User: Fold Desmocollin-2 from Homo sapiens.
Amino acid sequence: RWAPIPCSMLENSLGPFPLFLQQVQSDTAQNYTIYYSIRGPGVDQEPRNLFYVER
Amino acid sequence: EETYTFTIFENCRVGTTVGQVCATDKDEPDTMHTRLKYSIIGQVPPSPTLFSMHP
Assistant:
């Protein structure tokens, strides 16, 4: 399997927020309707709701 | 509503009510065209589980 791909954010920013980082979808999204989520330390493991995805 | 809000207390007992939502369908009342079924699809956080819904 291909490895995952970095992204970086800068500390204590004057914003505004939600501050965007990158977009991630399927390619095969055109075959049938899906929706998006995340789990892990930073949304639902702690620190909670640090990170956010448009469904 | 597209987005409800409800309040409860801390330390409440299991089977405590949070709230009741309502909905309608535009076919003939009390037919199968309008007969309704309710379910949870997820949680924030996903886990641990805290709430349920009567179908």
Summary: The CA atoms of residues 6 and 43 of chain B lie 15 Å apart. The interface with chain A takes residues 44-47 of chain B (CB under 8 Å). The radius of gyration of chain B is 14 Å.
